[PDB]
Structures are given as structure tokens and as C-alpha cells.
Amino acid sequence: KGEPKVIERLNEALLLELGAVNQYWLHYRLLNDWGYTRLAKKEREESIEEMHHADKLIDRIIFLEGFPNLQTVPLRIGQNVKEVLEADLKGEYDARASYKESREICDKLGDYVSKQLFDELLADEEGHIDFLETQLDLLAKIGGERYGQLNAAPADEA
Amino acid sequence: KGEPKVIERLNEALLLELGAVNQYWLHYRLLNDWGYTRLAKKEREESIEEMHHADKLIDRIIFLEGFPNLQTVPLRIGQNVKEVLEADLKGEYDARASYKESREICDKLGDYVSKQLFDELLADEEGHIDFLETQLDLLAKIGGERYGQLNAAPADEA
Amino acid sequence: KGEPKVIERLNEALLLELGAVNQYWLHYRLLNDWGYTRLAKKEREESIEEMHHADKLIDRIIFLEGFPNLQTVPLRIGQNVKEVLEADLKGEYDARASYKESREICDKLGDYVSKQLFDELLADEEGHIDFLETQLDLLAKIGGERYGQLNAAPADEA
Amino acid sequence: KGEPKVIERLNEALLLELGAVNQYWLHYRLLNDWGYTRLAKKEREESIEEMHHADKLIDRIIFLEGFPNLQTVPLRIGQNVKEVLEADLKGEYDARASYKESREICDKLGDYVSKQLFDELLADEEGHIDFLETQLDLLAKIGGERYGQLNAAPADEA
Amino acid sequence: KGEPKVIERLNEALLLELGAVNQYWLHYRLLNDWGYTRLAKKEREESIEEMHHADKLIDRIIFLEGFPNLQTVPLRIGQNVKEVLEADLKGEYDARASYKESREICDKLGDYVSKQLFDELLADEEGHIDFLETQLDLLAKIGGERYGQLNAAPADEA
Amino acid sequence: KGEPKVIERLNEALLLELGAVNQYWLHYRLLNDWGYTRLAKKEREESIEEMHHADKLIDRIIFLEGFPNLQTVPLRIGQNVKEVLEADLKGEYDARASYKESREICDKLGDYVSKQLFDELLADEEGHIDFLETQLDLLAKIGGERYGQLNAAPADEA
Amino acid sequence: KGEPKVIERLNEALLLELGAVNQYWLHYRLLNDWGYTRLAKKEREESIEEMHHADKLIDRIIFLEGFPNLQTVPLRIGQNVKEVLEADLKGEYDARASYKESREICDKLGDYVSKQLFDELLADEEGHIDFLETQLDLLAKIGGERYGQLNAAPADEA
Numbered sequence A, B, C, D, E, F, G: 001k002g003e004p005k006v007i008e009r010l011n012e013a014l015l016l017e018l019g020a021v022n023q024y025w026l027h028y029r030l031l032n033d034w035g036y037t038r039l040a041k042k043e044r045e046e047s048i049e050e051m052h053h054a055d056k057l058i059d060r061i062i063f064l065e066g067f068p069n070l071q072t073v074p075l076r077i078g079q080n081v082k083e084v085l086e087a088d089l090k091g092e093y094d095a096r097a098s099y100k101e102s103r104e105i106c107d108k109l110g111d112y113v114s115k116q117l118f119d120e121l122l123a124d125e126e127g128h129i130d131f132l133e134t135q136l137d138l139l140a141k142i143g144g145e146r147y148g149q150l151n152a153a154p155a156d157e158a
């Protein structure tokens, strides 16, 4: 049986990951319908990565004899490519902060395996952040139109 | 641009499908940790099927120039195998009813392609219901213990 | 042109075989919907075997310049696994008796090739009976619940 | 549990499909013994297609908690190739009419999945009718003898 | 023999589909000679899809004992990429409307298989419309020049 | 050492089978020179089947310590396709009768293995008769000219 | 930029080729529904060949800075196999005449590449004519019924 405080931090992470799943998937479908099929494929992949994170969190909570809360998911959606990237980045920044605090809480309470899980999430999060910051830097340098064109497919593909 | 009433019925279905995704996936992890790895694999597959349904609903709403609502997901969880099956079945019964009413609404408003989508969902739902009713009938006949054993793997598998 | 008495015995066998086809196939679908998918597959195979018997009977009647009577099919259906097996067994017992009398009638009338056909049916029938008696003996020894479990598949199969 | 009226329409279709199975199979054996082995192979295939229809009807009735009636099968048999085709066509015309009325009954009662099954049967039936009308048109144009020759194999085949 | 009103709706659809074939193929050749070889390939594919639609309509009219009218084809041609897409989209909008009215006419007259054909056309039409609206949205976002470049091949290809 | 009466019945069958070999082979060569190469191939196959029958009869007679009589072979030859088929059929009718009487003689004398050999010959004979009656029925229905054409090859074959 | 007179001759050929496409395709579907599936396949192939001709004409007109006229297509349809062949032949005779005059016009005006295109069409046309005259000669010699039978498939094919 796990610490109530640790289970609570795991559920907070689960809430964020479920929100990230929905936001990334909505962005995938919006981007696809706008014609940015290449970037859309990446957002789909990012959504599926957050799905695996939520699964690991659920698995850990059950092992600790807690109750995973999937009953709740706030979503930030953009109207253009730049706002989609910035919304994803904002969510990753919020997740990183939550996991950094959760890591310390698990460390102080002696739940080192749960600490290890948050460390893994932290490493994954900054990998996400590095990619998104790079894409936003590229968009700023070549312009949103050229960034959109680069991430759109020609009419005869697929 | 689609009818507001049709978009609203599509969003109601999306809310149910997102709830079904979470419930099926939670059941998959609960069943797996209880040792019912075979039934757990099926619940995982059912979750992924509802994921595809939610994707089709999102896609249709966007095409109709509406806004998909993923910001919301009620979850019914069981404490044993029988209650897990009955909770899944209850959700499918509720989904079938919603889709049957939505089909008629789309028909009367002349949105026949959205009607076709609800018809496809209805056919899928009763396929789910047929399977679940069969499993619950089998459980009643051979008993919950034997049903659990039949859907558990030996210790050396995987 | 064949003996009227032989043609009549061939049509009596055809009536029984068509009844066996329908009974076995109904049992296949009932057993499948109850969750006994393994035994259901066997009943399907048994139905198809009786289908081939009916075909041979039709073929022989036509060669004898008679008229096959497919216009008629009595069906005995069970409510549980044991009654399904006992109903199949009862039909096979009735078929064996009919074929044993038909064999002698063909022998006395000098239609030895039609006699040979009934001998083949007799050998097939007692093969059916041997299998069914064995299954009913197993059910009695291990119990109907365990017999049902043994002939049911786990939820994730197929 | 399904509507009694829907179950009754499903059983009426089952009666027709079982009749079509027997008629097509008898025609297959008659045509084969007359030497029209090519057309005979097609009638065999048509019989097996109606067998699959009867299976789907049985499956649907069981899912609706009704009792499939296989205890009954009227057969129309011809004495030449043209009458065989016309008898098959007559049965398909009768089946189409039954399914068209059954479709409307299921629609009014809100059993849309059963409606979908009758729609599938209707599409299959008119596919049968199109083929049979074409064969009868060809027979009229080139004559019954040439039609028979075209659908007979030489003595050394198979 | 089919309803005169249904045959008339099928011929109206045939007129539209034949017009769409010619318009899409002309656009394919115009776009190819302008250097937009990628989009040109898609327009060629769209033309061939409408060719298959016209074939299904002809086939249905003949089965209903009507006379397909191929003696007639109005064509809207653009002078740049955007006007080509908008002309295709306009034709698809007109086809969708015709098929939606034809579906209802077939439903009221009890020709459900012809209704099914218009439903299939409707689903195909909105698939066309979804693609074209997406391409026009992309063109608006990245500009006609970049859209043209994205759908043009370099000088050494093929 | 076998019964003289059984050996005599085996030699009577051998005389008939040797006659059938020669008649079928002569028919094969006549039909081939008339241009009915397809039917000719079948007559060749039938001749070779009767050759195997004669071999089994010789083998059985030797095992019974009798002397096979191959020193004798009456042949019925036709002048057209129909008379060839009718002559073959007449011989098979005569063989069937001989084997039916021989079967009973072996049964009464207790030579059950020789009885089994005549039963095998009887089954083979009625297979021959079924084929020949079918071909003669086909010839009557489509006419001798069309039957001949169906069983003739074009000038460039082989 | 091309001669107006040459562009006009190219558009006249395009009108004829589009008419030939529709006539051949209608004949393909009529012949198929009458049961002449073999000849129907050839008419389908002929239709597709005229489709390629129309494409080459469109391509040449665009290269000459003219406007292809696809807005227009007269169709001659038969009621039996012979009239179908004669209608196709009549159209090919009319096309040959048009192309022979167009060739001379291009020659006199010094547009030798357009002349080359009409020469290619002329060679193709007389290939069509040779085939059609041969088929009509065969039909006259063996009769329309036997010609129809030769170009019909047995009921079990495809």
C-alpha cells in the first residue's frame, strides 16, 4: 500500500497526461483538416506517447492500492499552426513542473520506484519541449507560411 | 456547415465514447492486476475500438464546422469480473440508445452521411452487446470462478 | 430405374439427414451464443457432414429415376449443453435404426449399390454415436460446468 | 429482447432462405445429372450463398431472444434448363418482396440493425435477380440448346 | 422494371457524373501543362473515380429497364489553381444536392437498392468535398504561389 | 484353392472386361479419327479403367489356383457418336448383371473376399453407367451435332 | 500558338472520340447485361482505347493554345449483337473520313506534328475497322446465335 500523498501526485500527473492525449489528438485532426498532414502525423504520434504515459501512471497507482481518476481531463486549442505548437508547449511546461515537484515528494517519502517513474516522465517531457521549441524557432525564422508548406503534403499523396 | 442539432448529437456521442475508452482501459489494467490476463487483453482491444469511434466522431464534427468537446468524459468500475462486464454492458446499452435517437434526428434533418455514421456505430454497439451478453451468460452457467480461471493465464506465460 | 421401395427408403433417410443438418446447425449457433465456442465448432462440422450425406442420398435417388423429397424436414433442441448432446445422440440413434432396416431391404431386393450406401451411412452414424457417448460420459464424470468450461474459449480468442 | 413482429419477419425470411437452399441444391444435382455441369456449379454456389443468409438470420433471431424456426421449408422444380432458371428467379422475386416489407416494418419499429440486415439481403437478392434475368435473356437469344451446350462440359473434363 | 421517376433521377446523376469526368480530366491536362504535376495526378484520379460512378449508374439504369442518356454532358474551367479547385468543389456541391433529393425520392417510392446507390454516392461526394475544402483552406493559409510550388514537381522528375 | 464355381464366375467377368477393353479402345481410335478428340480421351481413360479391372480378376483367379482365360474376348461398334455411347452402355449393363449374379454366388459359397471384388466392380460399373446415361441425356437435349462439337477440339490444339 | 483551322479539326476529332467513348461503354454494359460477356470485355477495351485518343487530342489542343471542347458528345445504339457491331463500325468509318481530311489540312498548313497525330489516329482507326469487319463477316457465316454463344461465358465463370 502506497503513501496517500504519492498516489495523489500520480493522479495529478494522470489528469495532465489525459488532457495532453486529448489536446494532441484534437490538434492532429485540426491540422489534418487544415492540410498540414506532415505535422498532423507528428501530433498523432505525440498523442500516442502521452497515452503510454497515462497507462504507466494507471499501472503504478493500482500497484500502490490507489484508485486511478480518469473521470476528469482544461484544453487549449489554437486557430493556426503557431498557436497549436504553443499550446502543446504550454502543456508540456506545466507537466514538467508538476513532475519535478512530484519527484521531490516521492524522494522525501522514500518511494524511490515512483520517483523513478517521475524521472522517466521528466526526461520524456524535456524531449518533447526540445522538439517543440525547435519547431517554433524554425517557424519564426522561415515564417509561418513556409513552415506550413513544409509540413503539408501535395494533393496526390496517400 | 452542419446543423447545430446534428453537431450536438455528435458531441453527445463523443462524450460517451471517451467515457467508454477510459472505462475499458481502466478495466484492462484492473483485470490484468487481478490475474485475468486473457479477458484483460480483450478489454484493451475494446478500448482501442472505442478510440477509433471517438476519432471518427471528431473528424465528422470538424468537417461540419463544429467544435469537438473533449473537455469532459461518468465512469462505472466493478470490483470483480462480473461487475466489470456488467458495467461495460451498461455503457453500451446507453450508447446504443443515444445513437438510435441521433440516427432519427439526422434523418429528419437531411444529414444522411451523419446518419450513416450513427448507423455504423449502432451496428458496432450491438456487436459489443452480443459479445458481452454471451460472456455474462457463460459466467452464469459455469460460475464466476471457472470463468475467471478460463480467462487467466498460467504463471509462466509471456 | 430403381425399385420404388428402395427409393422410398432413400427418401426416408434424406428426411432424417435434412433434419440432422438443421438441428446440428441450430445447436452450433445456440452453443456459440452461450459461449461454448469449441463445442460449437464441432457441431458446425457435424452439420456439414450430414450435409454431405444428404447430397449422396439425393444423387442416388436421381440416378434411380426417383424424385428427392426436400420439401420436409421434427427438431429436438436443448436448453443446456447436456440436452444438446442428448438430442443429437437421439437423432443418430433414430438414423442408425432406419439405415439398418434400409440396408436389409436393399439386400433382399438386389440393389447392392444402394445397400453399400446405407452401409457407409451406418459406419458414419456409429462414428457419430461413439463420439457423442464419449462426450456425455466425460460430462457425467467431470460435471456439466467443467465440461462447459473445457469447451468454451477465453474472451480474447478469435 | 426484440420485437415479436421483427422476430416474425426474420423467421419468414428464414423459411424462404431454407427453401432457396434446398431448391438450388436440388437444381444443382438435377443439372449435373443432365450434363449441364457448368451451370450446375453455379447453382451449387448460389445454394451455399443462401446457406450463409440463413445463418445470418438464425444468428440475429437468437440475439433478439427469439426461437429460429427451421422445422419448415414449397419447392418449385423444373424439367429443363429454362424452367430451372425461372423457378430460381420466381423464388428470388418472392424473397425480394418479403424483405422489402420487412425492411419497412423494422424501420417503423426502430430496430435499425435488423433493418440493415434486410437491406443487405435486398442488395444480395437483386444481384441474384440481375444474374438470372441475364441468363434467361441469353437463353432466349441463342436458344435453349445452345445455352445448354455452353453450360455443359466435354466428356473428358474433371 | 423500375419507376420512371427513379430512372429519371438516375439519368440526372449520370449527366452530372459525365460532366464531372470531363471537367476533372480537362483540369488534369491544364494543370499538367501549367507545371502542377502533383495536383494534376490527383485530378486524374478524381476523374477516374467519377468514371466508376457513371458506370454504376449506367448499370443500374439498364437493370431497371431504362435507357441511359450519355448523349449530353455544363463545364466550368478555371484559369489558375484556385479556380480549378473551386470549380471542382462547385460541381461536387451540385452533385451532393441532386443525390440528396434522389435518395428521398427512391425511399418514398420503395426502391431501396437505388436509394442505397445514392447513399453510396453521397458518402463519396462528401469525401470529395472534404478533400477539396481542405486544399482550398491550405491554399488560403500558405498562399497560391506556395500551394502551386508544393504541387509542382522539379524539372528532372519522371 | 477356390471353388470351381467362383473361378468360373471370375473368368466370365474377365471375358467381359477384356471385351470392354477392346471396345473402348477401338471407340477411342474411331472417335479420334472422326474429330471427337475430347470424348476420345475419355474413352481411352475408360479402356484403361477396364484394363485395371481385368488385372484384378486375373490376380484373384491365380490366388484361387485357377487358370485365367484370356484366350477369348463379342464387340459392338457404332458408326456415330450416339451409337458408340449406346454400345458402351449396353456392355456396362451386361457386366452389371453378371457381377450381381456373381456376387450372390460368392456369398452363398462363403467366398467373401471374391464377393467383395464383385461388389467393387458393381460400384465401378454403376459409376460408368451414370456417366454414360448423363452423356446420352445431354446428347438428346442439345442434339448430336452440338454434342459432337462440344467434344471436338479446334484444329490448332495439341 | 496553332492555326485556328488546325485547332478546329482537332476539336472535331475530339467530339467524335468522346462520342465513341460513350457509345463503346454503353455497348459494353448492354452486351454484358445480355450475357455476351466476352464481346463485352472487348467493347470495354475499345472504349478505353478511344479514351486515350481523346486524351492525346486534348493534350495537343492545349499545346497549341486552343480550348478543348468537351461540352458536347450523336450516339447510335443497337438492340442486338449485330447492330452493336454495325453501329461501332459506322462511327469508325465517320472518324476515318474526318481524320483523312484533317491530315490533309494540317499538311497544307505546315503543322506536321498535328498531321502526324492524325496519321496515328488513321492507323488506329483502320485497325478498329479491320477487327469489326472481321467480326461481322464471322457473324454472317456462322449466324448471329452461334456468334452470340461464342462470345458468351458459361454461368459459373467469374
Ligand code: HEM
Binding pocket: A018, A021, A022, A025, A048, A051, A052, A054, A055, A070, B018, B021, B022, B025, B048, B051, B052, B054, B055
Ligand atoms: C485513457 C485514455 C487513453 C489511453 C490509456 C490510451 C492508450 C492507448 C495505447 C496504449 C495505444 C497503443 C499505441 C500503439 O499501438 O502504438 C493507443 C492507440 C491508439 N489510440 Fe489511445 N489511449 C487513450 C485515449 C485515446 C483517445 C482520446 C483517442 C482519440 C481518438 C485515442 C486514439 C487512439 C488510436 C487511433 C490509436 C491507434 C490504434 C490503431 O492504430 O489501431 N486514444 N491508445
Ligand code: HEM
Binding pocket: C018, C021, C022, C025, C048, C051, C052, C054, C055, C070, D018, D021, D022, D025, D048, D051, D052, D054, D055
Ligand atoms: C439440403 C440441405 C443442405 C445441403 C445439401 C448442404 C450442402 C452443403 C455442402 C456440400 C457444403 C460444402 C461443405 C464444405 O465446403 O466443407 C455446405 C457448406 C455449408 N453449409 Fe450446407 N447444406 C444444406 C443445408 C444448410 C443449412 C440449413 C445451413 C444453415 C446455415 C447451411 C450452411 C452451410 C455453411 C455455412 C457452409 C459453409 C460454406 C462456407 O464456409 O463458405 N447448409 N453445405
Ligand code: HEM
Binding pocket: E018, E021, E022, E025, E048, E051, E052, E054, E055, G018, G021, G022, G025, G048, G051, G052, G054, G055, G070
Ligand atoms: C473525357 C472522357 C474520358 C477520358 C479522357 C477518359 C480517360 C481514361 C483513361 C486515360 C483511362 C486509363 C485507362 C487504363 O488505365 O487502362 C481511363 C480508364 C477508365 N475509364 Fe475513362 N475516360 C473518359 C470517359 C469515360 C467514361 C464516360 C466512362 C464510363 C464509365 C469511363 C470509364 C472508365 C473506366 C471504368 C476506366 C478503368 C479504370 C479502372 O479500371 O480503375 N471513362 N479513362
Ligand SMILES: [Ca+2]
Binding pocket: none
Ligand atoms: Ca454384405
Ligand SMILES: [Ca+2]
Binding pocket: none
Ligand atoms: Ca435508411
Ligand SMILES: [Ca+2]
Binding pocket: none
Ligand atoms: Ca507524309
Ligand SMILES: [Cl-]
Binding pocket: A029, A030, A032, A033, B059, B062
Ligand atoms: Cl480531420
Ligand SMILES: [Cl-]
Binding pocket: A059, A062, B029, B030, B032, B033
Ligand atoms: Cl495493472
Ligand SMILES: [Cl-]
Binding pocket: C029, C030, C032, C033, D059, D062
Ligand atoms: Cl449465435
Ligand SMILES: [Cl-]
Binding pocket: C059, C062, D029, D030, D032, D033
Ligand atoms: Cl446428380
Ligand SMILES: [Cl-]
Binding pocket: none
Ligand atoms: Cl441449328
Ligand SMILES: [Cl-]
Binding pocket: E029, E030, E032, E033, G059, G062
Ligand atoms: Cl497537357
Ligand SMILES: [Cl-]
Binding pocket: F029, F030, F032, F033
Ligand atoms: Cl485414329
Ligand SMILES: [Cl-]
Binding pocket: D146, F146, G146
Ligand atoms: Cl450450334
Ligand SMILES: [Cl-]
Binding pocket: E059, E062, G029, G030, G032, G033
Ligand atoms: Cl450491365
